[PDB]
Amino acid sequence: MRTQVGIVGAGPAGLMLAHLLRREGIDAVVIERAAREHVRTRLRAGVLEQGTVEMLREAGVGGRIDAVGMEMHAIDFRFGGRSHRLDFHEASGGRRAWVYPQHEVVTDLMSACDAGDVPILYEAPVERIEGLEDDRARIVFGQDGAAGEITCDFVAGCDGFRGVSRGSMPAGIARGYDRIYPFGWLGILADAPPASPDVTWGCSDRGFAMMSMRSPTVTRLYLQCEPDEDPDAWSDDRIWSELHRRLDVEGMPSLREGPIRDKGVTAMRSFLSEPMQHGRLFLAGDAAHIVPPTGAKGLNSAMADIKVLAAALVDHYRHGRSDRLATYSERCLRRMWLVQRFSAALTTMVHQFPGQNEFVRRLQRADLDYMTGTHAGRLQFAENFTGLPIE
Amino acid sequence: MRTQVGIVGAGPAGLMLAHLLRREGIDAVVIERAAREHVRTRLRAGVLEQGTVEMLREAGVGGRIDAVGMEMHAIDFRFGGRSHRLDFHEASGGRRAWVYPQHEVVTDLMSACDAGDVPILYEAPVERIEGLEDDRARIVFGQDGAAGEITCDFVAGCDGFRGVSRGSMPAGIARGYDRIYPFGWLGILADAPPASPDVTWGCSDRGFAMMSMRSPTVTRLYLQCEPDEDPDAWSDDRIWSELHRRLDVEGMPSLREGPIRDKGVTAMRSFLSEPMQHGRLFLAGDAAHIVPPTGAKGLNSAMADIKVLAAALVDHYRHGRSDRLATYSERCLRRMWLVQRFSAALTTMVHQFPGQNEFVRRLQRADLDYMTGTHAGRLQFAENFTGLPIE
Ligand SMILES: Cc1cc2nc3c(=O)[nH]c(=O)nc-3n(C[C@H](O)[C@H](O)[C@H](O)COP(=O)(O)OP(=O)(O)OC[C@H]3O[C@@H](n4cnc5c(N)ncnc54)[C@H](O)[C@@H]3O)c2cc1C
Ligand SMILES: Cc1cc2nc3c(=O)[nH]c(=O)nc-3n(C[C@H](O)[C@H](O)[C@H](O)COP(=O)(O)OP(=O)(O)OC[C@H]3O[C@@H](n4cnc5c(N)ncnc54)[C@H](O)[C@@H]3O)c2cc1C
Ligand SMILES: [Ca+2]
């Protein structure tokens, strides 16, 4: 009930922070609203930036990703009826990404926290965060009709976009930047080995599509769809038909069809909240900012926030310096606004906007041509996709 | 009344083509709707790409660029209260730009067309163009209720955005891409020395402003204004006061004030029409495409179209090959869509859009931070501003 850092949310951001604080001897308690089996079994794809992989390695939780993490070097941007394999490994001078599912990361982080005796309260939704300028902050929650409270020097808000920590900021201090895109992603799993080994984007004018490897025998496929789209309106035949039209090009093998599983719709939205700290409250991850998943930046941005947050807390407790805590939001926001810039730039380029001005629509092809066909375009994509530096 | 290439419009595009075809022994006739002095002094500003400068020198009309012109190595992007000098000379690996106004270019091309006996009919608006799919094309012009006619092998549509050649293509051929921006430019000429040795862009949240330098004595200044702004609503002191607010930064010399001579409101519009040819008609310059002047691309695009058109025509009359004429629209539209992309990107970054989504508006600063603060950002701006390859 008394700790140094109270961590709201046992997602990737919260578990990584608790793991980093434990190895530094800083005490922390994680409070999660969902059941432990629900957090682990929440499946989601995962493209990790190199900085994220190095962060997991150096924290002693990179053994499994170094064992089976699939190194990723290129994206096949398909448009104009042709392939455009952008080798961002070459274009970034040796930096790359790793295909490693997010549910594997949390499983690795949950194992590290469990092995480290990190207290994690599950099925205990936080109801209030108070005392942000008091001697100690108070995390009010309830487990099963019984209310609880964690007292802590600092509250790390790692409770995601729909958590409570962002709303716990003072109203006169918080400011939001919100943009919802007029489309969603229809995601499926296909029981068929992928056609090509590269992550493949269909960026033609019939709509956005994406093809990636979920496993050696399962393909992950996305289709741009209406924002409020019912997955029942998409039969298997319609899905494969639209997937063929948006992805197939001459000179490349046709799409591998198979039984479709796990049909779902995900939203597309850019949101950022300022500041990311006030008093004893520090926001990180989706609690402070979300991006359209086009650039695979959300989890990597969360890990970047935690990297800065963990170091600042170590400087406070271990070295008696509070200036790094005071610059947490400042440094995280600089990187995150460039991440927001990159995720939006990809989203507005590869998706079809209903009723969009025809000149702006044609600029999408012009942006695709320049990004893939010029050294400057390939350079900017490579450095952003593999991960911007962390301050 | 009979020539080889009938040129519609005596702007920089039409004059440059008439001179180039004359240097190679090809006969041409220019038909201008306005007076001679009106065309010469229509626009008293302009920045030239390096490729445009070399083209003028190799054509024999670029001897005055060293004296009258102003060579550029950097632009001072001012925002957030600070200067950000982007040295596009170093970033592009040696390429640069020149401040050489359009009224100086036209005077040079008028001299060459005069010194080479190029027939130019002024105050004779072209009314109709026919025979594009016949063995010979006809240009029907008029003057005081008097119809004239000019027969030619090919028609060069260089009559600008308000011209008639773009509408001369058969029904269903032409397709237009049009996007208007919700602001205009209030441009002035001032008898005041430049406050800094570099062309300065004011990317303020009050609106865009620019300080260009005609000479060490005169300054060219632009202000973002309402699209149909009444220049009468902008007194001298209001202009200087707003220019101070959008340009002055601490630590840099303040803007100098002086007598204001030129003053006018110009629109901000992106337009491009496809194709740039049909049979014996060939469009060049503003007749086929206009951009917002944010990136100094209109004239340079017109000179890029003429360089391809003059080469294809010389290849036709000298070697009997129409292969380059058949690919004129193909190659010109390839470069122009990248030029449209760069002109739109700068325009949507540096101007304030009323009622804009807050996230998108804040991305303007993110785009400004990346363009000036990263090697990848500077490289892309440098190569684009100094001029893309023409091919
Ligand atoms: C389809 C898709 C694909 C993606 N692909 C990628 C990719 O390739 N690469 C990448 O880097 N990112 C990717 N992302 C983004 C990434 O998944 C998210 O950014 C990431 O989940 C953020 O983690 P987080 O810990 O900050 O938030 P979350 O993962 O949402 O964790 C928040 C946790 O807090 C808990 N919680 C909520 N409210 C409370 C409360 N009141 N009290 C207590 N606990 C609470 C939640 O139950 C949850 O466990 C993708 C996202 C989507 C949707
Ligand atoms: C404020 C401003 C700043 C600019 N700055 C730059 C810059 O820095 N760099 C740059 O490269 N560009 C710049 N531009 C763009 C540049 O001025 C134009 O793109 C350029 O004038 C295009 O040349 P053109 O010959 O194709 O068209 P025009 O210059 O418009 O020539 C067309 C000619 O045809 C004539 N004509 C029209 N209709 C007919 C008809 N029916 N019959 C006969 N004749 C006809 C017109 O009278 C005119 O003389 C700027 C433009 C503006 C408005
Ligand atoms: Ca108290």
Author numbering:
A (entry chain A), B (entry chain B): 1 to 391
Quoted passage from the original study:
Para-hydroxybenzoate hydroxylase (PHBH) is a group A flavoprotein monooxygenase that hydroxylates p-hydroxybenzoate to protocatechuate (PCA). Among proteins in this clade, Xylophilus ampelinus PobA (XaPobA) preferred PCA as a substrate and is the first known natural PCA 5-hydroxylase (PCAH). The overall structure of XaPobA comprised a homodimer, with each unit binding an oxidized form of FAD in its active site. The XaPobA monomer consisted of FAD-(amino acids 1–73, 88–198, and 267–391)- and substrate (amino acids 74–87 and 199–266)- binding domains.
In contrast, XaPobA replaced the Thr347 residue with Cys347, which has a side chain that does not interact with Thr294. The kcat value for PCA was 20-fold lower for the XaPobA C347T mutant that mimicked PaPobA, and 2-fold higher for pHBA, compared with WT XaPobA. Pre-steady state FAD reduction by the C347T mutant in the presence of PCA proceeded at a 30-fold lower rate (kred = 6.5 ± 0.7 × 10−1 s−1) than WT XaPobA. These results indicated that Cys347 is involved in the ability of XaPobA to discriminate PCA. We also determined the ligand-free crystal structure of the C347T mutant at a resolution of 2.06 Å. The Thr347 residue formed a hydrogen bond with Thr294 and fixed the peptide bond in a conformation similar to those of XaPobA + PCA and PaPobA. Taken together, these results indicated that Cys/Thr347, located distal to the active center, plays a role in fine-tuning the position of the Thr294-Gly295 region that fits PCA to the hydrophobic cavity, and regulates the substrate preference of PobA.
